[PDB]
Amino acid sequence: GFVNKQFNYKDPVNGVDIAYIKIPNAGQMQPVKAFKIHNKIWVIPERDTFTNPEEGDLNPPPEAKQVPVSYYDSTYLSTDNEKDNYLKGVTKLFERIYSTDLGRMLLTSIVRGIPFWGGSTIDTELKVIDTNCINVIQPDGSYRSEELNLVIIGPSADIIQFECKSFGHEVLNLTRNGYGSTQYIRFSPDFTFGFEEAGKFATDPAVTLAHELIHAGHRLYGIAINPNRVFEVSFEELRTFGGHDAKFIDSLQENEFRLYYYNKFKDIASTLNKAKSIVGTTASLQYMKNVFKEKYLLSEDTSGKFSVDKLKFDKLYKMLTEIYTEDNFVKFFKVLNRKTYLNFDKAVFKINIVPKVNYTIYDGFNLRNTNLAANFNGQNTEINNMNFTKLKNFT
Numbered sequence: 215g216f217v218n219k220q221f222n223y224k225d226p227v228n229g230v231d232i233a234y235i236k237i238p239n240a241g242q243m244q245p246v247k248a249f250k251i252h253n254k255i256w257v258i259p260e261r262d263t264f265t266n267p268e269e270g271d272l273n274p275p276p277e278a279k280q281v282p283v284s285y286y287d288s289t290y291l292s293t294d295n296e297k298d299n300y301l302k303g304v305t306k307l308f309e310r311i312y313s314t315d316l317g318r319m320l321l322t323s324i325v326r327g328i329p330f331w332g333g334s335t336i337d338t339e340l341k342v343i344d345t346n347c348i349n350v351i352q353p354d355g356s357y358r359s360e361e362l363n364l365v366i367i368g369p370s371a372d373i374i375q376f377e378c379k380s381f382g383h384e385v386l387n388l389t390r391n392g393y394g395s396t397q398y399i400r401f402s403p404d405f406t407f408g409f410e411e412a413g414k415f416a417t418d419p420a421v422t423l424a425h426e427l428i429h430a431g432h433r434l435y436g437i438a439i440n441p442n443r444v445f446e447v448s449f450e451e452l453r454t455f456g457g458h459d460a461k462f463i464d465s466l467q468e469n470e471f472r473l474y475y476y477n478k479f480k481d482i483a484s485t486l487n488k489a490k491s492i493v494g495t496t497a498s499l500q501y502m503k504n505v506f507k508e509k510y511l512l513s514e515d516t517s518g519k520f521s522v523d524k525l526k527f528d529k530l531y532k533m534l535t536e537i538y539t540e541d542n543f544v545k546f547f548k549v550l551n552r553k554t555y556l557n558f559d560k561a562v563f564k565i566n567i568v569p570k571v572n573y574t575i576y577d578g579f580n581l582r583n584t585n586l587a588a589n590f591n592g593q594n595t596e597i598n599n600m601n602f603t604k605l606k607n608f609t
């Protein structure tokens with residue numbers, strides 16, 4: 215069990231894994247209720263009007279986006295009952311990912327991918343970067359800063375627009391310099407989108423969650439591909455999807471990144487070797503050096519000096535970029551999914567995966583030994599139409 219506490223939205227704030235928090239935006243938000251579902255991983259059942267203050271309006275833009283399908287409902291996820299159902303849906307999707315060997319590995323990589331402590335201006339000093347923490351409220355209304363890797367939060371205006379984002383640094387490129395940064399996944403377990411293979415099917419939301427987690431893996435290890443490298447669809451998406459589209463990046467080009475991130479891990483190793491002091495109270499310098507030794511799989515000699523093992527690196531790199539793909543999860547879930555990143559259709563559905571009669575950790579929609587178990591009838595929006603309320607596309 216990846217999440218052993220089955221939280222309910224109205225559960226009392228115990229201050230440890232159930233609390234009112236603020237995120238490091240500097241937009242003086244009001245604390246929201248959040249739930250720590252696992253070490254380093256929090257869930258926030260709210261529409262995301264926080265990560266970007268430029269978008270605090272859950273209202274439609276005058277013209278609809280041409281692609282992909284978009285959906286707006288300013289009242290979705292505004293009630294404690296939806297918040298409770300959201301919380302329970304997100305949790306069940308984690309368990310489903312965890313129940314596979316690919317996912318269990320991905321989640322582990324995520325939990326140990328602590329963002330680097332490159333916060334200080336003194337190069338010999340380790341310091342946490344504040345945008346990689348959350349402020350947790352205390353009985354007396356004071357806040358305690360807590361580190362974390364991952365926050366799952368509800369969607370912004372466009373309810374079906376799922377994304378992995380994070381706070382930037384004024385000088386550093388945290389998602390592309392090996393450092394990594396706390397990841398915020400805009401995601402809903404309450405909706406999904408369709409695709410044709412006529413034959414109209416729905417995407418299993420576990421595949422969608424795994425997709426975002428894969429982005430999060432890249433960004434937590436600071437090896438994400440610059441979103442201005444497209445071809446429009448960006449390399450980062452092609453890589454994340456995997457399968458046929460993954461090989462749209464010739465080997466030589468890939469070797470450029472493979473080396474560009476080898477030397478980025480090289481630097482981190484040296485910054486670590488040259489550290490003489492640390493900021494904060496709980497963590498010793500050796501402790502943090504250790505954390506980062508696990509994260510990046512560094513090699514250490516008897517004198518406690520770190521170096522980058524090129525074979526260890528290759529394994530980690532390909533593990534995060536080639537083995538952790540949506541294509542591969544599709545195989546492990548034994549579900550049906552579109553074959554190319556763009557092979558979707560403009561269909562969005564309201565769904566409800568909480569009830570076991572609709573969706574299970576092991577089978578998803580394709581419930582075992584039933585009609586739904588044959589030819590992914592579970593995912594057929596017409597055969598299993600009781601689980602996919604087709605929604606009015608926005609235009």
Ligand SMILES: O=C(NO)[C@@H]1C[C@@H](Oc2ccc(Cl)cc2)CN1S(=O)(=O)c1ccc(Cl)cc1
Pocket residue numbers: 281282283374375376377378407408422425426429451556558559560561
């Ligand atoms: O890749 C995504 N997130 O990691 C995309 C980006 C955004 O959306 C898209 C989808 C396709 C294009 Cl060309 C542009 C924007 C969000 N989704 S997604 O939630 O994974 C998604 C949503 C709806 C569809 Cl129909 C397909 C994928």
Ligand SMILES: [Zn+2]
Pocket residue numbers: 425429451454
């Ligand atoms: Zn993506």
